[PDB]
From a paper:
DUSP22 is a small phosphatase containing 184 residues, and the sequence contains a catalytic domain as well as an N-terminal myristoylation site. This enzyme is broadly expressed in different tissues and plays important roles in the regulation of signaling pathways, such as inactivating the T cell receptor (TCR) signaling pathway, activating the JNK signaling pathway, and regulating the phosphorylation of focal adhesion kinase (FAK). The phosphatase domain of DUSP22 consists of five twisted β-sheets and six α-helices, and the structural scaffold is similar to that of DUSP3 (VHR), while DUSP22 does not contain an N-terminal α-helix surrounded by the N-loop. In this region, the catalytic activity is facilitated by C88 in the P-loop and D57 in the D-loop, and the hydrogen bonding network is formed by D57 in the D-loop, S93 in the P-loop, and N128 in the N-loop.
The crystal structures of C88S, C88S/S93A, C88S/S93N, WT_VO4, N128A, and N128D were determined in this study. All of the structures contained a ligand, PO4, VO4, or SO4, bound to the P-loop in the active site. The binding of the pTyr-like ligand was representative of the first step in the catalytic reaction, and the binding of vanadate represented the second step. Unlike Q262 in PTP1B, N128 did not rotate to stabilize water during the two catalytic steps. The DPN–triloop interaction was maintained in the catalytic reaction, suggesting that the stable interaction among the three loops was necessary for catalysis. Structural alignment among N128A, N128D, and WT_VO4 revealed that N128 participated in forming the conformation of the D-loop.
Numbering used by the authors: -1 to 155
The structure:
Amino acid sequence: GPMGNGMNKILPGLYIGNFKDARDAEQLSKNKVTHILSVHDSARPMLEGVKYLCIPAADSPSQNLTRHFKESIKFIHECRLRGESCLVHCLAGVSRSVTLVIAYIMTVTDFGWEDALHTVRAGRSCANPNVGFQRQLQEFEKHEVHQYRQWLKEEYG
Ligand code: VO4
């Protein structure tokens, strides 16, 4: 469906879901989620015992998300390196959250944005960044993802 079927594993320790999944204590415990990246209009820490990164962003092609790629990647990566699980979510888990996860995948692999989106869709079929976000991912692939990959190597080995 258009808001998924529950939070979905994309990579070990990295999940995408909708806003309901993000407060579902059963899903959070089953998937051992200790970090939540909430990227939506009124994003704020909700549940105790979880570490949050909140990004106020609209699901509009006018919304810039590139400014937030580096902080999102750091947050996801530091959680995954300590063996913990991170959930990235927006309202529906289709566009804003997916775009941040694509940028992460692109940085930890040699994938362009389309192969990263394929990876997301294998776990979460509804994934579909809006056209403004697709444009931003294409510019990231052409001019910046190589800088982010080098940064990741120098920072984390
Ligand atoms: O709540 V999202 O529309 O960016 O899938």
